[PDB]
A = this chain, B = another copy of it.
Amino acid sequence: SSYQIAVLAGDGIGPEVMAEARKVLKAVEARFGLNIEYTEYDVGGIAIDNHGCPLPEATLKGCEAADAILFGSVGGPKWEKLPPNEQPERGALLPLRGHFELFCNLRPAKLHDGLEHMSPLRSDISARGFDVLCVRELTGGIYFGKPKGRQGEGESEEAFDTMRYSRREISRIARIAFEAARGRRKKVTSVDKANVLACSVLWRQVVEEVAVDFPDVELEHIYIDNATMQLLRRPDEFDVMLCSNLFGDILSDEIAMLTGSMGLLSSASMNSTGFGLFEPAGGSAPDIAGKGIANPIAQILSAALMLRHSLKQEEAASAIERAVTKALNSGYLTGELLSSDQRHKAKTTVQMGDFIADAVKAGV
């Protein structure tokens, strides 16, 4: 019957861009005959304000009742004095990932044609282009490893976190990266610190075990400090980057920033049953919230990931992706995608949503 989506728009620009994601989703529901019901739940800063914590029980319950979470962005100044550890971002995202076993984070980042000038890369490097998919392991490693805590007092007070990975955890994320490379340019670069970390020694070992099932995919390994340098220099040489939790956190963000267009980038965090949480790569931009300035493309393309990965609605997902493409090549750019002197052509959040939804309707 009807798919059920828990909508967790969160803070800042989350609600206004989500409104555009929902608009485009309505055009897709009509075009493809999907029956999707949505329920909205507070999360993040709005949840602390409304319910006293960033992830209320009723929100958590609504995500359990759903086929996917369509997630906005969480965080901002108002809760920044809370300890970084009662704070809304980690307090929303980490238990959602842990609870639903969302072990796989997919962050596709590409330099779009015509938007190279916006990348912070030197012009000859951005002109080459890139398209890197970061596959990051999201539920193990040092984020969730135990023991974590502190003991002692005074100078000798000590804090500890444990990075742990099992062969099973590593091989499930590696297979995702290999399967994804098969569909792309047939290369996985696995990113670790095997010269220092026991977890990375096992990581590199297990990814090489997984590789035997993918004779058509090239595998290379690289150290995280070297990967961060090489992305600056030659990001066009990477296809799929495969990382543990902490390394993928850093590298996916680095690659996103190298596009210079984070308002175009979306993220899927999924479990093995196909449930996921789909969100823009960027933050809640509380400075521009409520102004019709924010670029809703990242949230619209998060809707498209949700349709593909959780709802198994490939044609609907790709129709949204084509409508975004059409916007970007038909002069429908928001302010942050425009060179400072073309800024007077900017479209508002609503104009972008209207255009992209209308494109879907026109059969793009």
Contact = CB atoms under 8 A, between A and B. Distances in A.
Interface of A: 83-85, 87, 89-90, 94, 119-123, 125-126, 142-143, 145, 148-150, 152, 154-168, 171, 193-199, 201-204, 224-226, 228-230, 232-233, 246, 249-250, 252-254, 256-258
B197 A161 contact: yes
Contacts of A121: 120-122
Contact of A232 (B83, B230, B258): B258
Given A120-B233, A121-B120, A156 B167 contact: yes
A359 to B, nearest CB: 31
Given A121-B120, A228-B250, A229-B257, A163 B166 contact: no
A83 B123 CA distance: 39
A120 B232 contact: yes
A162 to B, nearest CB: 5
A193 B245 CA distance: 12
A142 B161 CA distance: 9
A210 to B, nearest CB: 12
Contacts of A166: 152, 155-158
Nearest to A203: B159
Contact of A163 (B123, B160, B203): B160
A161 B162 contact: yes
B158 A164 contact: yes
B150 A159 contact: no
Contacts of A149: 198
Count of chain copies: 2
A228 to B, nearest CB: 5
A249 B167 CA distance: 26
Given A195-B89, A246-B193, A253-B225, A167 B160 contact: no
A233 B204 contact: no
A264 to B, nearest CB: 15
17 contacts: A84-B195, A89-B195, A120-B125, A120-B232, A148-B198, A150-B198, A152-B166, A155-B171, A160-B198, A161-B163, A161-B199, A224-B250, A228-B254, A229-B257, A230-B257, A232-B257, A233-B257
Contacts of A193: 246, 249
Contacts of A226: 253
A277 B254 CA distance: 30
A245 to B, nearest CB: 9
A254 B198 CA distance: 24
* 6 residue pairs, one from A and one from B, having the closest CB atoms: A159-B202, A229-B257, A90-B195, A225-B253, A155-B168, A84-B194
Nearest to A75: B195
